[PDB]
Design a protein around this ligand. Structure first.
Ligand SMILES: [Cl-]
Ligand code: NA
Length: 129
């Protein structure tokens, strides 16, 4: 599913992302835009053999099981395919675990390079929230 910007904002807000660990809604929408272009079905393979999955591009090295990342962990306790669903619940739940792990949203490379220190509120502007 390819989300609308406001549609996703509303979805994330409902799932308890707004201000989660201090990160305003705009940060999550920004991260999603640049990680996956709001596409739940986005996948990207990394040099190390791991794969990133879904709207927030969560990585199979630590967070989910895809059966093909030797010596990886499954800290979210889910198959990586569950991160590709039209229902963002699994991705949200897992992102909450990642952002609580000490490094905040810095775990998302696109957030750090393209959202951090920017006017992220702009990503939810005009939305009925
Ligand atoms: Cl933080
Ligand atoms: Na894994």
């Amino acid at each position: 599913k390819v989300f609308g910007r406001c549609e996703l904002a509303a979805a994330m807000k409902r799932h308890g992302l707004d201000n989660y660990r201090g990160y305003s809604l705009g940060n999550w929408v920004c991260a999603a835009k640049f990680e996956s272009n709001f596409n739940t079905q986005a996948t990207n393979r990394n040099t190390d053999g791991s794969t990133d999955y879904g709207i927030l591009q969560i990585n199979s090295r630590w967070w989910c099981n895809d059966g093909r990342t030797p010596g990886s962990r499954n800290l979210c306790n889910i198959p990586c395919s569950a991160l590709l669903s039209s229902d963002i619940t699994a991705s949200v739940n897992c992102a909450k675990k990642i952002v609580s792990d000490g490094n905040g949203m810095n775990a998302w490379v696109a957030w750090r390079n393209r959202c951090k220190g920017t006017d992220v509120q702009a990503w939810i502007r005009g939305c009925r929230l």
